[PDB]
Amino acid sequence: QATERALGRRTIPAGEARSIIIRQRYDAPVDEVWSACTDPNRINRWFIEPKGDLREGGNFALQGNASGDILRCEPPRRLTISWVYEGKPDSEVELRLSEEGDGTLLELEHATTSEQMLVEVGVGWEMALDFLGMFISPEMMRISQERGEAWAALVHS
């Protein structure tokens, strides 16, 4: 519907990280959004499907690098996973879904000790959450570039 970006702070294996925090409200209920964000036959519609044992302490790979472990899984609310990528320090991503009336307030936070990687990931999730939204690159470069300025400017100070 309409997104509020923010910055947090976390202690992850790679150390003290800051974080991207994306908040979006959806007019679907918590379950449906949980399923859409966790059932690989639904993640497959709007994003890249994960492979491996999708269960807690299990692990995931997405077709084009990124892989990681499934640290926490508290259906239908919370989801934490590690995030490993070739040239990159290790990261952590978390999804919290909360009820707001008949709908849900999604929250997606990706923490990383790399300042460069803050922007890159905030923007990368936002692009992806578009297709979640839909599900529930010339024009795209422009949207990538504005969104980058927003995260870049928030990361400044």
Side-chain angles (χ1 to χ4, degrees), residues 1-64 66-157:
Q1 175 201 128
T3 122
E4 179 182 77
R5 296 175 204 108
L7 298 176
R9 275 178 194 291
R10 251 155 68 117
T11 59
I12 66 172
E16 278 301 307
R18 325 214 314 185
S19 58
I20 257 43
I21 289 165
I22 285 163
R23 311 195 171 98
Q24 299 186 305
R25 215 205 138 187
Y26 304 97
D27 198 14
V30 160
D31 273 52
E32 296 179 33
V33 179
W34 181 251
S35 261
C37 264
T38 67
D39 185 0
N41 293 315
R42 296 204 190 161
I43 297 164
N44 233 177
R45 296 237 58 38
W46 58 273
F47 191 56
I48 302 167
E49 191 196 307
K51 286 181 156 48
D53 50 319
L54 306 184
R55 51 148 197 83
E56 204 169 51
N59 83 297
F60 80 94
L62 316 164
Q63 188 67 34
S67 57
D69 295 293
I70 299 179
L71 313 177
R72 203 78 171 160
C73 205
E74 291 165 357
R77 288 180 80 91
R78 163 174 200 192
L79 206 248
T80 315
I81 57 149
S82 72
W83 194 268
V84 9
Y85 194 71
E86 173 64 300
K88 296 292 190 173
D90 280 21
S91 295
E92 206 164 294
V93 198
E94 193 180 282
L95 184 89
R96 311 166 217 102
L97 307 182
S98 36
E99 294 183 56
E100 178 187 336
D102 54 351
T104 125
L105 170 56
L106 171 142
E107 285 196 38
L108 191 142
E109 178 172 8
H110 193 145
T112 164
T113 60
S114 186
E115 183 158 62
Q116 191 171 317
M117 199 175 179
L118 268 191
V119 183
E120 287 173 354
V121 143
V123 176
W125 285 107
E126 270 182 278
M127 299 296 164
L129 288 166
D130 286 358
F131 289 80
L132 172 56
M134 289 196 212
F135 171 54
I136 295 162
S137 50
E139 299 184 310
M140 302 295 300
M141 274 178 86
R142 185 192 68 60
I143 295 166
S144 134
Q145 167 176 44
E146 285 174 9
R147 286 181 180 166
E149 281 163 20
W151 291 113
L154 293 169
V155 166
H156 270 222
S157 282

